[PDB]
Amino acid sequence: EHKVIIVGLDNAGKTTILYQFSMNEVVHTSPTIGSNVEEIVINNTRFLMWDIGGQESLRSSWNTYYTNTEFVIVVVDSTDRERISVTREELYKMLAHEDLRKAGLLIFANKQDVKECMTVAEISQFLKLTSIKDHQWHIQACCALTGEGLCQGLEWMMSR
Numbered sequence: 001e002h003k004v005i006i007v008g009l010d011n012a013g014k015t016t017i018l019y020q021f022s023m024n025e026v027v028h029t030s031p032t033i034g035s036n037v038e039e040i041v042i043n044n045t046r047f048l049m050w051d052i053g054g055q056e057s058l059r060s061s062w063n064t065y066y067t068n069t070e071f072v073i074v075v076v077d078s079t080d081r082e083r084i085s086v087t088r089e090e091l092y093k094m095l096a097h098e099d100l101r102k103a104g105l106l107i108f109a110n111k112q113d114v115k116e117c118m119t120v121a122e123i124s125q126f127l128k129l130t131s132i133k134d135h136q137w138h139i140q141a142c143c144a145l146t147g148e149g150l151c152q153g154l155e156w157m158m159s160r
């Protein structure tokens with residue numbers, strides 16, 4: 001009865017984040033008709049997960065899944081400077097969709113354990129987050145391997 005979308009490039013840390021969220025909680029894979037989206041239920045929250053930037057981004061059939069989404073979590077690999085422009089494009093296409101009008105936006109700046117990664121300030125600048133006025137948003141440094149920063153992101157969602 002809570003619905004959250006979690007998106008990001010392949011290798012961003014999505015599944016690692018969901019593992020962390022699932023520790024000491026009830027978790028199961030909820031069957032989905034397609035092979036595009038994976039639905040992971042953790043307690044009473046349904047997380048809908050997919051990779052951005054592929055063939056499916058040419059179509060975005062997953063926009064049927066936007067209905068009633070409470071939060072969009074965008075996972076960014078803070079080391080992947082080459083591809084972050086792809087995430088940016090996809091973020092703004094999502095924010096334009098009328099079915100996500102009510103959603104809050106949580107950006108996880110993941111892999112902040114890694115030397116020379118982009119800083120949270122730099123990611124925020126690159127993504128123009130200060131431009132986002134019609135959705136509430138938060139950006140959060142994390143390391144999904146250890147879980148550091150994940151509880152802060154969860155609290156932001158729970159505060160809302």
Ligand SMILES: Nc1nc2c(ncn2[C@@H]2O[C@H](COP(=O)(O)OP(=O)(O)O)[C@@H](O)[C@H]2O)c(=O)[nH]1
Pocket residue numbers: 008009010011012013014015016017075110111112113114142143144145
């Ligand atoms: N160094 C580091 N590696 C990470 C972090 N989060 C995830 N990884 C690793 O990056 C790879 C991709 O992560 P994964 O969760 O499978 O990404 P997904 O494709 O978005 O689901 C795996 O080898 C993870 O162990 C992190 O915060 N720091």
